[PDB]
C-alpha cells in the first residue's frame, strides 16, 4: 500500500542524505594520516567530495576545499611510545612552541573585514561613537593573574564594530608595552580584572601584534591559543 511505499522510499532518501552530509563534512582534515604525516591506509567507507570553491569578498581571492592540507609550521613534539595511539610530548616550552592546548593555526596574516571592507576589530579609541553603554568599564583597572599578582592595567577595549561587541582588552605591562587579552578569558570585577589562565610572569610572553591599530587572524589565533594554554601549563603557579 501507499504508506509502505512512502516509508521505504523515505529510508532510501535518508540514506542518501547521510551519505551527502558525511562527505560534505570531509572537506577539511582529510585525507587521514599516520602519526608521521603519511597517508593512512584506511580512509573509511566515504570518498572525498568533489572540490568546491568559495569566492572571498574584498578581492581576497578564492578558497577550494578539499585541497592541500599543511600545518605550514614546525611542531615541537616527539613520540612517547613505540606504537600508535599515545600522547606526543612537547620537546621545548609548549606555551612558546604553540602545541597542545596552546596551539594556533597559521591563518592568513590579514585582519578580518566587515561588509564594507573595513577592519572588523578596532581599539575603541579609534572607533568613532563607540563607548561603554552598560556594565563596569574595565579601562583603567589593574589586571591580576592566577598567582594573585598584578601584571598590568587595561588601557583600552578592542571592539567588533559591525557586531558592536567587546572582543579584547588591551593591557599595558610594567615595561610600557601592551598585549591583547581575549574578552572571554577575563573576569571583570568592581576593582580589578582577574585572569585565571595566566600567572603574572607569563603576560610578557603573550604574542605581540605588528600594528597598534589592528589584529590579523594569524595574531588572534596565536594570542588566544597562548592564553588558553595557560590553563594547563601555567597550573604550576595558579
Amino acid at each position: 500500500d501507499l504508506a509502505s511505499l512512502a516509508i521505504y522510499s523515505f529510508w532510501i532518501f535518508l540514506a542518501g542524505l547521510i551519505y551527502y552530509l558525511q562527505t560534505e563534512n570531509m572537506r577539511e582534515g582529510y585525507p587521514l594520516e599516520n602519526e608521521d604525516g603519511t597517508p593512512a591506509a584506511n580512509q573509511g567507507p566515504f570518498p572525498l567530495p568533489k572540490p568546491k570553491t568559495f569566492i572571498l569578498p574584498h578581492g581576497r581571492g578564492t578558497l577550494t576545499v578539499p585541497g592541500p592540507e599543511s600545518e605550514d609550521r614546525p611542531i615541537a613534539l616527539a613520540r612517547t611510545a613505540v606504537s600508535e595511539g599515545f600522547p606526543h610530548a612537547p620537546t621545548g616550552d609548549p606555551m612558546k612552541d604553540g602545541v597542545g592546548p596552546a596551539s594556533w593555526v597559521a591563518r592568513r596574516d590579514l585582519p578580518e573585514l566587515d561588509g564594507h571592507g573595513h577592519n572588523k576589530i578596532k581599539p575603541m579609541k579609534a572607533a568613532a561613537g563607540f563607548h561603554v553603554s552598560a556594565g563596569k568599564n574595565p579601562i583603567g583597572l589593574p589586571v591580576r593573574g592566577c598567582d594573585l599578582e598584578i601584571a598590568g592595567k587595561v588601557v583600552d577595549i578592542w571592539v567588533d564594530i559591525p557586531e558592536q561587541m567587546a572582543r579584547f582588552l588591551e593591557v599595558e605591562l610594567k615595561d610600557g608595552s601592551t598585549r591583547l587579552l581575549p574578552m572571554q578569558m577575563v573576569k571583570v570585577q568592581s576593582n580589578r580584572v582577574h585572569v585565571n589562565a595566566l600567572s603574572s610572569d607569563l603576560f610578557a610572553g603573550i604574542p605581540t601584534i605588528k600594528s597598534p591599530t589592528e589584529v590579523t587572524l594569524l595574531e588572534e589565533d596565536k594570542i588566544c591559543g597562548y592564553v588558553a594554554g595557560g590553563l594547563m601549563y601555567a597550573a604550576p603557579k595558579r
Partner: protein, 302 residues
C-alpha cells in the same frame, strides 16, 4: 569561577547600523528603533530598522485580520463581557463548518463561515510572508535556504488545514482556532486513527524533534566552548580555518569517533530541523486518507 560567556560582562555601543545595501530598496526600510540594554546582555542591543515593502504590509494586514476575526468571535461568545473574556479565554473556539457543508463556502457565519474567512486571511498572511523571506534574501544576494526551510513548516501547516481536509471531503476535518480546543483536536485525531504512536512517520518526526534539541545543545555548547578562540565567527572560520574550528572538531572526534566542519555542522542542523515537519506532514496526510487505523496497519504493513 571562570567566565562562561552566557551573558556579556560589558556592553559597548556605537552609531546605529543601517545595514548592508546591495540591491535593497532603501526607501522601504524604516528608521532604527531604540537600543535595548536588556537584550544587550544576551545578544544585540539594536532594534530596527525593519523593511516594510508591499508584500510585507500585505502579510501584516492579513495577519491582523486573521487575528481579529478570531477575537471578534471570542468576544461574541463572552457576551461582550470583559470579565467573561478573561475568565474563559482558553476555552473559546472558532470551530470549522459542520460536516454537512462539506467543502463548500456556503456555511453560515455562525457555523464555520467565519472560520473560513479567518482561514483565508491566515493563508494570505503566511504565503506572502514566505515570498518575503525569499525576496529579502535575493535583495542581498544570499542563498534561499531560509525560504526553503520555511517551506517545510508550511508543509505541515498546509496539510493540517488545507490538503488533508480537501482529500477527506470537508472543512470539518481541519483544526479549530482555540487554545484548549486545538489541544483536544490533537488528542482526538490520535484516538480516531488508532494510536499515532503506531504511525511510523510520527515516530521519525519525534526522532528529529528530539534530535534538534540534542544537536542545538551540542552546537551551541561547542561554539561557546571555543568562543575563547573566536569560534562564533563561523563564516571566516569556514573561509580560513582557525584553532577554534580544529578544537571543536577534535572534541567530537575524540568523544564519538567522527566530526563535522564549521560549514558542515550547519548542513546537519538545517536538515535535522527541516525533517521534523517534513516527515510529520507526510504522517498526517496519510492518516484517514490511506490509513484508518495505525494499529491495524502496523499488524500487516499494508
Amino acid at each position: 569561577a571562570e567566565y562562561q560567556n552566557i551573558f556579556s560582562q560589558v556592553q559597548v555601543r556605537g552609531p546605529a547600523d543601517l545595514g548592508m545595501t546591495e540591491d535593497v530598496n532603501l526607501a522601504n526600510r524604516s528608521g532604527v528603533g531604540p537600543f535595548s540594554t536588556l537584550l544587550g546582555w544576551f545578544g544585540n542591543a539594536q532594534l530596527g530598522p525593519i523593511y516594510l515593502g508591499s508584500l510585507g504590509v500585505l502579510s501584516l494586514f492579513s495577519g491582523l485580520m486573521w487575528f481579529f476575526t478570531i477575537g471578534i468571535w471570542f468576544w461574541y461568545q463572552a457576551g461582550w463581557n470583559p470579565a467573561v473574556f478573561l475568565r474563559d479565554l482558553f476555552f473559546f473556539s472558532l470551530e470549522p463548518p459542520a460536516p454537512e457543508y462539506g467543502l463548500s463556502f456556503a456555511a453560515p457565519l455562525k457555523e464555520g463561515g467565519l472560520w473560513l474567512i479567518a482561514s483565508f486571511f491566515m493563508f494570505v498572511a503566511v504565503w506572502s510572508w514566505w515570498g518575503r523571506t525569499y525576496l529579502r534574501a535575493q535583495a542581498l544576494g544570499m542563498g534561499k535556504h531560509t525560504a526553503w526551510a520555511f517551506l517545510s513548516a508550511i508543509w505541515l501547516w498546509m496539510v493540517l488545514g488545507f490538503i488533508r481536509p480537501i482529500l477527506m471531503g470537508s472543512w470539518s476535518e481541519a483544526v479549530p482556532y482555540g487554545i484548549f480546543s486545538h489541544l483536544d483536536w490533537t488528542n482526538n485525531f490520535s484516538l480516531v486513527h488508532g494510536n499515532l504512536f503506531y504511525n511510523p512517520f510520527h515516530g521519525l518526526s519525534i526522532a528529529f524533534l528530539y534530535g534538534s534539541a540534542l544537536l542545538f545543545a551540542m552546537h551551541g555548547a561547542t561554539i561557546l566552548a571555543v568562543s575563547r578562540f573566536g569560534g562564533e565567527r563561523e563564516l571566516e572560520q569556514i573561509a580560513d580555518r582557525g584553532t577554534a574550528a580544529e578544537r571543536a572538531a577534535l572534541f567530537w572526534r575524540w568523544t564519538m569517533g567522527f566530526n563535522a566542519t564549521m560549514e558542515g555542522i550547519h548542513r546537519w542542523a538545517i536538515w535535522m530541523a527541516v525533517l521534523v515537519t517534513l516527515t510529520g506532514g507526510i504522517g498526517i496526510l496519510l492518516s484517514g486518507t490511506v490509513v484508518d487505523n495505525w494499529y491495524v496497519w502496523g499488524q500487516n504493513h499494508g
